[PDB]
């Protein structure tokens, strides 16, 4: 059910949030706490505040990740996502709130798939 | 007993903290799911004025009837030991009970109540009623996480670190809240609401907040309070034609409101002087 | 007796409160499951009329049949000891009872009534009738949760986290509501409904809600009252060719409605003026 | 029994709601409160109102769950179930409203079973 | 106990380091997203004061509630066994526990605590409350990264060629922070706040930052604290007027602020001191 | 996707930085070092030093580029990107740092095109 181009801000933001959570999780194993839990409600309500800080935090995890191939593939997926969106909205609507969770969950399901992401890198 | 029915508009702003409590299911400030506006339940505002009474008068004829450790059934029962209610009958029991209850309290005399739990006493409707309040412009929550110096208990989490669980403190950067209120004389007869009591109400609102603080609440304060009074026991004009006279607007050249300076208040009294009095209280 | 025949349309909104709640579904507002629109059963609005009269008139020839706490058979029997104690010999003794009742209680003289419980006193259809009233556009109910400081009883003597049971309150962020009302003439001739009663009735409708404020309802109002006046005892034109001339429409710009400024009201008076009349009351 | 992929909207929404309820249950053990009376009435016609709002606060309950295995298992389960949907509908037909209840009860029966979710997770 | 309602405005600045570490994102200064201002959480202030008192007094009736490692339930059970000397009714037992607490720990008399988590001991309220403090002007964050001479652990990271422990020690070139605080006499009576304890509080503020230095923290200094003393038990004026009597203005000449000289403090007390007592305690 | 003239500092400067990154990466096939992450957090914090230094860095990487048509196309496009800007702000607020990252990732995909930049130079 992972659409590639839904273009709804909620869906794409949920995809982005899933990417962020997975990156952070793979970055350091010894951590049960999830940034998703700490930020989910505020993010789905309004993305500007949480997302600015998340952007600032991203490079640290990105570089300190041990393996290079995971880093390049994650950056590539970020590229494949960001071109739909344009600018962080100030506020969300209800259907957007739901579609955000939908996109997040869909992207999580795609990421847990073992090799498909590596493939999509390969056709690039 | 008070005669002229009243209407009033109330404007109070929360500075830097949870203005109303968590919805008890998902702990945040109360928020409109769709518009992005914010609400404070009226009951909270009512309880604030109740506390102010409890700490201000301290006299018989001004008891409060809901206290942190009171148990309602015994309070009802003890009223069944007054002399008037000794020898009466089914209807008469209840009627005398209501008379005595309204006699001794002020909470009951001003806001209604339900007294049918045990030995019944009835209901009252309360001459004074208040609505929900709503935020003028959408509020943008903030969530904060903070740590505890020491473990809560020598529980399974008796480990040295508290970095596993921290707990959070939500907050709101700023806003305003608008509230409406009605005073109806037709009920004053049934309870004995008196002019002195109304004066207490007016003095209570303006100083409700300063005499009440807490950690979670953070600073709050009250800005506006405008009262219209009618000339006769029948409304001269319906409510809305009045309420539109008092309007507040976000300033022209501001994108985000961050203080009372941002908003702008305006008052309409072009014709209002027909048979109505506009008393300005808040400022 | 009224020598004309009236049909009218009524427009009223709700701001932040449960207009009338399912006696079964907890207390949540009455909604249409398939289309998600609101409902306000007629008996509710009629009861508001009766309460208004109770407060305003308080003499004889405007007493009201239904009361807060009373015995109906007592009211019937009391009528059975008027002058016509038995002189009508059970043939029109019941008819005499009808005439006396309709002579006193304005409620029965206006709306229908059934008095056949004990010593049967008759039936009246009622010159005035009202329809259910429903919401123009769907509404979404905002459940809440609130908390009381102290426990009612001692049965839950202990106070724990699960204790202090919350209990709830329901609200509706906005809406709008259409009402359709009919007035008969030939029925009017039976129970002496008079023009003066009609004038009182219009004033009852326009000023109904200000004199009724509870905790739950919150603010309500009256947006419009339009009256189409026949020119014959015979129905001049059918109903729909009347009603369709007053069309209320959601404005385009907004997807979610929040206040009366959003909606748009259109009154059509092409050629009905030739016989029929249209008078504006709401505004 | 329970259809894995009946795919009609009511059934999947009912399964989702049942899972959320069970999460609320184990998250707060010392409790009897049920979201049942809270939101069946909402869920029948306009899920678009209620589902996203609940989803906002699921992560808190999930984190407050003490045991990691239950949390991750239920996480994977809801990831599986949400695959079928693509968009929260705003209105439902009568048969949809009923089938929502049927799905809820089938899902509750399946979850309360002793080890089924364990087996499915272990497959994952 | 207390004598007059008390209010105070508080200022303090940081030359370098991290005033408060946000655990949301790394350890950035807690910053307001939209306006680019930095919130200093109050709980930090309160912890600093507790630490100072723990440092200096070290005597009975002045023990500090939240020590470095103390497990709370041991303290509450210790008190209960101490007042198992009472061993009496639950309400009395809880109240006696409260009293023994308030007698013992300066923290509790000074600020509340939820002791009831274990064997219940109640909810104190605390008569001193402080709000969040926010930077007067937008902050400036300058991330820094540094090098470790040796690897933390004998792992795969023990390669000389690649070093990744760049570290992060954020800081601020300069700023200021403003806070408001309230001392309400009435609540003392439940906890028995005493004049001397208030005096030690006044002392602990103006002399705090000298006893709290850390590597990550860096230099801080308090600039000016002002105390308003109420004339009588009820507030003679609203808090807002009193607070806004004090103003801070960025110097016109400067566009970037790097030192106290770049700011100007304006104090005004021509008339609103007619019954208030302004003490310019510091600065 | 991207915009040539979104006309804000973060978007354009991130575009600038990604341009520089690909220039240096392509000019040296034997360039394992990830200069991108070396200055990314720096620029997101404040550019006033890093970009000035990178400007004097440029001509060496320019000359040591193997193919000269690539180089001339590069200074061409650089001309269009820099024409929009009018000054360097030292301080950088959060939202335009977000737009910085947005512009970076957006224009990276433009960079990855097989022949687009050559075409854009062709109509020049």
PDB file of N, CA and C in Angstrom, chain A residues 1-2 6 11 33-34 36-37 40-42 44-45 94-95 97-99 101-102 105-106 108-110 112 114, chain D residues 48-50 52-53 55-63 75-76 78-80 82-88 124:
ATOM      1  N   UNK A   1       0.808  -1.204   0.000  1.00  0.00           N
ATOM      2  CA  UNK A   1       0.000   0.000   0.000  1.00  0.00           C
ATOM      3  C   UNK A   1       0.842   1.256   0.000  1.00  0.00           C
ATOM      4  N   UNK A   2       2.150   1.080  -0.147  1.00  0.00           N
ATOM      5  CA  UNK A   2       3.075   2.209  -0.154  1.00  0.00           C
ATOM      6  C   UNK A   2       2.994   2.899  -1.503  1.00  0.00           C
ATOM      7  N   UNK A   6       1.849  10.349  -3.211  1.00  0.00           N
ATOM      8  CA  UNK A   6       0.505  10.732  -2.797  1.00  0.00           C
ATOM      9  C   UNK A   6       0.344  12.243  -2.806  1.00  0.00           C
ATOM     10  N   UNK A  11       0.905  12.602   4.354  1.00  0.00           N
ATOM     11  CA  UNK A  11       1.500  11.328   3.975  1.00  0.00           C
ATOM     12  C   UNK A  11       3.007  11.446   3.833  1.00  0.00           C
ATOM     13  N   UNK A  33      14.307   3.777  23.903  1.00  0.00           N
ATOM     14  CA  UNK A  33      13.498   4.975  23.724  1.00  0.00           C
ATOM     15  C   UNK A  33      13.431   5.365  22.255  1.00  0.00           C
ATOM     16  N   UNK A  34      12.257   5.808  21.828  1.00  0.00           N
ATOM     17  CA  UNK A  34      12.010   6.150  20.438  1.00  0.00           C
ATOM     18  C   UNK A  34      11.682   7.629  20.330  1.00  0.00           C
ATOM     19  N   UNK A  36      10.127   8.776  18.014  1.00  0.00           N
ATOM     20  CA  UNK A  36       8.747   8.781  17.549  1.00  0.00           C
ATOM     21  C   UNK A  36       7.782   8.986  18.704  1.00  0.00           C
ATOM     22  N   UNK A  37       7.981   8.263  19.804  1.00  0.00           N
ATOM     23  CA  UNK A  37       7.109   8.448  20.957  1.00  0.00           C
ATOM     24  C   UNK A  37       7.183   9.871  21.484  1.00  0.00           C
ATOM     25  N   UNK A  40       5.668  12.397  18.406  1.00  0.00           N
ATOM     26  CA  UNK A  40       4.660  12.069  17.408  1.00  0.00           C
ATOM     27  C   UNK A  40       3.482  13.029  17.460  1.00  0.00           C
ATOM     28  N   UNK A  41       2.917  13.232  18.649  1.00  0.00           N
ATOM     29  CA  UNK A  41       1.734  14.069  18.751  1.00  0.00           C
ATOM     30  C   UNK A  41       2.004  15.497  18.327  1.00  0.00           C
ATOM     31  N   UNK A  42       3.097  16.073  18.827  1.00  0.00           N
ATOM     32  CA  UNK A  42       3.431  17.442  18.461  1.00  0.00           C
ATOM     33  C   UNK A  42       3.701  17.558  16.970  1.00  0.00           C
ATOM     34  N   UNK A  44       2.533  15.637  14.411  1.00  0.00           N
ATOM     35  CA  UNK A  44       1.309  15.531  13.627  1.00  0.00           C
ATOM     36  C   UNK A  44       0.425  16.752  13.823  1.00  0.00           C
ATOM     37  N   UNK A  45       0.445  17.335  15.019  1.00  0.00           N
ATOM     38  CA  UNK A  45      -0.254  18.597  15.224  1.00  0.00           C
ATOM     39  C   UNK A  45       0.358  19.701  14.375  1.00  0.00           C
ATOM     40  N   UNK A  94      -7.325  17.795  10.005  1.00  0.00           N
ATOM     41  CA  UNK A  94      -7.620  16.499  10.613  1.00  0.00           C
ATOM     42  C   UNK A  94      -7.265  15.342   9.688  1.00  0.00           C
ATOM     43  N   UNK A  95      -7.777  15.371   8.461  1.00  0.00           N
ATOM     44  CA  UNK A  95      -7.451  14.319   7.512  1.00  0.00           C
ATOM     45  C   UNK A  95      -5.951  14.254   7.280  1.00  0.00           C
ATOM     46  N   UNK A  97      -3.820  14.935   9.639  1.00  0.00           N
ATOM     47  CA  UNK A  97      -3.335  14.261  10.836  1.00  0.00           C
ATOM     48  C   UNK A  97      -3.380  12.752  10.655  1.00  0.00           C
ATOM     49  N   UNK A  98      -4.499  12.233  10.156  1.00  0.00           N
ATOM     50  CA  UNK A  98      -4.577  10.798   9.926  1.00  0.00           C
ATOM     51  C   UNK A  98      -3.602  10.314   8.866  1.00  0.00           C
ATOM     52  N   UNK A  99      -3.551  11.016   7.732  1.00  0.00           N
ATOM     53  CA  UNK A  99      -2.704  10.574   6.635  1.00  0.00           C
ATOM     54  C   UNK A  99      -1.239  10.594   7.037  1.00  0.00           C
ATOM     55  N   UNK A 101      -0.023   9.609  10.013  1.00  0.00           N
ATOM     56  CA  UNK A 101       0.212   8.303  10.606  1.00  0.00           C
ATOM     57  C   UNK A 101       0.226   7.228   9.538  1.00  0.00           C
ATOM     58  N   UNK A 102      -0.657   7.353   8.551  1.00  0.00           N
ATOM     59  CA  UNK A 102      -0.712   6.335   7.507  1.00  0.00           C
ATOM     60  C   UNK A 102       0.615   6.260   6.762  1.00  0.00           C
ATOM     61  N   UNK A 105       3.377   4.650   8.894  1.00  0.00           N
ATOM     62  CA  UNK A 105       3.287   3.206   9.051  1.00  0.00           C
ATOM     63  C   UNK A 105       3.657   2.501   7.758  1.00  0.00           C
ATOM     64  N   UNK A 106       3.199   3.045   6.632  1.00  0.00           N
ATOM     65  CA  UNK A 106       3.514   2.438   5.350  1.00  0.00           C
ATOM     66  C   UNK A 106       5.016   2.412   5.117  1.00  0.00           C
ATOM     67  N   UNK A 108       7.385   2.483   7.353  1.00  0.00           N
ATOM     68  CA  UNK A 108       7.990   1.500   8.242  1.00  0.00           C
ATOM     69  C   UNK A 108       7.883   0.104   7.651  1.00  0.00           C
ATOM     70  N   UNK A 109       6.713  -0.228   7.107  1.00  0.00           N
ATOM     71  CA  UNK A 109       6.548  -1.553   6.525  1.00  0.00           C
ATOM     72  C   UNK A 109       7.502  -1.761   5.360  1.00  0.00           C
ATOM     73  N   UNK A 110       7.678  -0.737   4.527  1.00  0.00           N
ATOM     74  CA  UNK A 110       8.610  -0.841   3.411  1.00  0.00           C
ATOM     75  C   UNK A 110      10.037  -1.029   3.897  1.00  0.00           C
ATOM     76  N   UNK A 112      11.160  -2.343   6.704  1.00  0.00           N
ATOM     77  CA  UNK A 112      11.461  -3.650   7.276  1.00  0.00           C
ATOM     78  C   UNK A 112      11.648  -4.707   6.195  1.00  0.00           C
ATOM     79  N   UNK A 114      13.413  -6.641   3.383  1.00  0.00           N
ATOM     80  CA  UNK A 114      14.827  -6.928   3.600  1.00  0.00           C
ATOM     81  C   UNK A 114      15.718  -6.265   2.556  1.00  0.00           C
TER      82      UNK A 114
ATOM     83  N   UNK D  48     -13.051   9.158  10.387  1.00  0.00           N
ATOM     84  CA  UNK D  48     -12.054  10.172  10.059  1.00  0.00           C
ATOM     85  C   UNK D  48     -11.883  11.136  11.225  1.00  0.00           C
ATOM     86  N   UNK D  49     -12.924  11.288  12.034  1.00  0.00           N
ATOM     87  CA  UNK D  49     -12.811  12.148  13.201  1.00  0.00           C
ATOM     88  C   UNK D  49     -11.937  11.513  14.274  1.00  0.00           C
ATOM     89  N   UNK D  50     -12.141  10.225  14.544  1.00  0.00           N
ATOM     90  CA  UNK D  50     -11.692   9.677  15.820  1.00  0.00           C
ATOM     91  C   UNK D  50     -10.383   8.907  15.679  1.00  0.00           C
ATOM     92  N   UNK D  52      -7.585   9.108  13.817  1.00  0.00           N
ATOM     93  CA  UNK D  52      -6.346   9.860  13.877  1.00  0.00           C
ATOM     94  C   UNK D  52      -6.091  10.440  15.252  1.00  0.00           C
ATOM     95  N   UNK D  53      -7.140  10.960  15.886  1.00  0.00           N
ATOM     96  CA  UNK D  53      -6.990  11.506  17.226  1.00  0.00           C
ATOM     97  C   UNK D  53      -6.464  10.450  18.184  1.00  0.00           C
ATOM     98  N   UNK D  55      -4.746   7.789  17.321  1.00  0.00           N
ATOM     99  CA  UNK D  55      -3.395   7.470  16.884  1.00  0.00           C
ATOM    100  C   UNK D  55      -2.397   8.462  17.450  1.00  0.00           C
ATOM    101  N   UNK D  56      -2.825   9.712  17.632  1.00  0.00           N
ATOM    102  CA  UNK D  56      -1.947  10.706  18.238  1.00  0.00           C
ATOM    103  C   UNK D  56      -1.353  10.193  19.541  1.00  0.00           C
ATOM    104  N   UNK D  57      -2.161   9.531  20.356  1.00  0.00           N
ATOM    105  CA  UNK D  57      -1.751   9.189  21.706  1.00  0.00           C
ATOM    106  C   UNK D  57      -1.435   7.714  21.899  1.00  0.00           C
ATOM    107  N   UNK D  58      -1.617   6.875  20.879  1.00  0.00           N
ATOM    108  CA  UNK D  58      -1.089   5.513  20.998  1.00  0.00           C
ATOM    109  C   UNK D  58       0.365   5.432  21.455  1.00  0.00           C
ATOM    110  N   UNK D  59       1.320   6.197  20.909  1.00  0.00           N
ATOM    111  CA  UNK D  59       2.721   5.976  21.306  1.00  0.00           C
ATOM    112  C   UNK D  59       2.955   6.093  22.797  1.00  0.00           C
ATOM    113  N   UNK D  60       2.259   7.011  23.464  1.00  0.00           N
ATOM    114  CA  UNK D  60       2.412   7.137  24.908  1.00  0.00           C
ATOM    115  C   UNK D  60       2.025   5.851  25.618  1.00  0.00           C
ATOM    116  N   UNK D  61       0.846   5.319  25.302  1.00  0.00           N
ATOM    117  CA  UNK D  61       0.434   4.045  25.871  1.00  0.00           C
ATOM    118  C   UNK D  61       1.466   2.971  25.584  1.00  0.00           C
ATOM    119  N   UNK D  62       1.946   2.920  24.342  1.00  0.00           N
ATOM    120  CA  UNK D  62       2.894   1.888  23.950  1.00  0.00           C
ATOM    121  C   UNK D  62       4.153   1.954  24.797  1.00  0.00           C
ATOM    122  N   UNK D  63       4.680   3.157  25.002  1.00  0.00           N
ATOM    123  CA  UNK D  63       5.883   3.290  25.810  1.00  0.00           C
ATOM    124  C   UNK D  63       5.604   2.937  27.260  1.00  0.00           C
ATOM    125  N   UNK D  75       3.154  -3.709  17.768  1.00  0.00           N
ATOM    126  CA  UNK D  75       3.583  -2.765  16.751  1.00  0.00           C
ATOM    127  C   UNK D  75       3.592  -3.414  15.377  1.00  0.00           C
ATOM    128  N   UNK D  76       4.210  -4.588  15.269  1.00  0.00           N
ATOM    129  CA  UNK D  76       4.241  -5.264  13.980  1.00  0.00           C
ATOM    130  C   UNK D  76       2.842  -5.638  13.525  1.00  0.00           C
ATOM    131  N   UNK D  78      -0.046  -4.100  14.118  1.00  0.00           N
ATOM    132  CA  UNK D  78      -0.771  -2.950  13.592  1.00  0.00           C
ATOM    133  C   UNK D  78      -0.149  -2.479  12.289  1.00  0.00           C
ATOM    134  N   UNK D  79       1.164  -2.650  12.139  1.00  0.00           N
ATOM    135  CA  UNK D  79       1.770  -2.399  10.838  1.00  0.00           C
ATOM    136  C   UNK D  79       1.167  -3.307   9.776  1.00  0.00           C
ATOM    137  N   UNK D  80       0.985  -4.586  10.101  1.00  0.00           N
ATOM    138  CA  UNK D  80       0.360  -5.503   9.154  1.00  0.00           C
ATOM    139  C   UNK D  80      -1.048  -5.054   8.810  1.00  0.00           C
ATOM    140  N   UNK D  82      -2.631  -2.189   9.092  1.00  0.00           N
ATOM    141  CA  UNK D  82      -2.840  -0.910   8.438  1.00  0.00           C
ATOM    142  C   UNK D  82      -2.414  -0.947   6.978  1.00  0.00           C
ATOM    143  N   UNK D  83      -1.750  -2.020   6.556  1.00  0.00           N
ATOM    144  CA  UNK D  83      -1.347  -2.143   5.161  1.00  0.00           C
ATOM    145  C   UNK D  83      -2.547  -2.071   4.230  1.00  0.00           C
ATOM    146  N   UNK D  84      -3.648  -2.726   4.602  1.00  0.00           N
ATOM    147  CA  UNK D  84      -4.791  -2.827   3.702  1.00  0.00           C
ATOM    148  C   UNK D  84      -5.391  -1.463   3.394  1.00  0.00           C
ATOM    149  N   UNK D  85      -5.501  -0.600   4.394  1.00  0.00           N
ATOM    150  CA  UNK D  85      -6.145   0.684   4.173  1.00  0.00           C
ATOM    151  C   UNK D  85      -5.255   1.610   3.359  1.00  0.00           C
ATOM    152  N   UNK D  86      -5.869   2.655   2.816  1.00  0.00           N
ATOM    153  CA  UNK D  86      -5.154   3.722   2.136  1.00  0.00           C
ATOM    154  C   UNK D  86      -5.621   5.111   2.527  1.00  0.00           C
ATOM    155  N   UNK D  87      -6.809   5.241   3.109  1.00  0.00           N
ATOM    156  CA  UNK D  87      -7.367   6.553   3.392  1.00  0.00           C
ATOM    157  C   UNK D  87      -8.572   6.363   4.299  1.00  0.00           C
ATOM    158  N   UNK D  88      -8.633   7.178   5.353  1.00  0.00           N
ATOM    159  CA  UNK D  88      -9.736   7.128   6.304  1.00  0.00           C
ATOM    160  C   UNK D  88     -11.018   7.637   5.663  1.00  0.00           C
ATOM    161  N   UNK D 124       7.828 -13.358  11.606  1.00  0.00           N
ATOM    162  CA  UNK D 124       8.402 -12.116  11.115  1.00  0.00           C
ATOM    163  C   UNK D 124       9.880 -12.026  11.466  1.00  0.00           C
TER     164      UNK D 124
END
